[PDB]
Symmetry: none
Subunit: 49 residues, 5 copies
Amino acid sequence: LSPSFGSTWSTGTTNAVEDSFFQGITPVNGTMLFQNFPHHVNPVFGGTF
Amino acid sequence: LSPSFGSTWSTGTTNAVEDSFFQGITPVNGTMLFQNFPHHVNPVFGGTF
Amino acid sequence: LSPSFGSTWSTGTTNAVEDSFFQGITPVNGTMLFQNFPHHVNPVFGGTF
Amino acid sequence: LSPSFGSTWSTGTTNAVEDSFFQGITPVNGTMLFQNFPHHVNPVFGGTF
Amino acid sequence: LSPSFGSTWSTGTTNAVEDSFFQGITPVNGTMLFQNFPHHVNPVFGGTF
């Protein structure tokens, strides 16, 4: 087994605020927990032309 | 097993504010916990032209 | 096992404010905890042209 | 096992304000805790052209 | 096990204000704690052209 991946690219802004990244061989046997609950937030997101 | 990865690239701004990165062989057997709960926040995000 | 990674590159600004990086063989058997909760914040993020 | 990594590169500014870096073989068996909670902050982030 | 790393490079400014670096074999068995909470701060960050 020999997977081939591609490069990751970006030209404009990239606002990766609050997240988690992994890469490469990552065997898991224990426990991994991901829970998310903000409870007073008023976001705004923009469109495009 | 011999995975091949690509380079990571960016030309514009990259505002990686609050996050966690991993790379390479990272076996896990214990516990990993990720929990997120901001509770008074008013974000704004921009669009494109 | 012999993974091959690529270089990490950046030309513009890179505002890595508040985060954690790992690289290389990092076996884990204990506990790792990541929790995030700012509670009075008014961010702004910019778009592109 | 013999992973091969690439160089880390930057041409423009790099404002790594408040963070933690690791590199190389870093086995962990105890506990590692990461918690973040600023509670009166008004950031601004810039876009690109 | 014989990982091979690359050089770390920078041409422009590098304002590494408030952070912690590690390199090389760093086994950990006790406890490591990282907590961050500034509570009256008004940062500004710049974009690119």
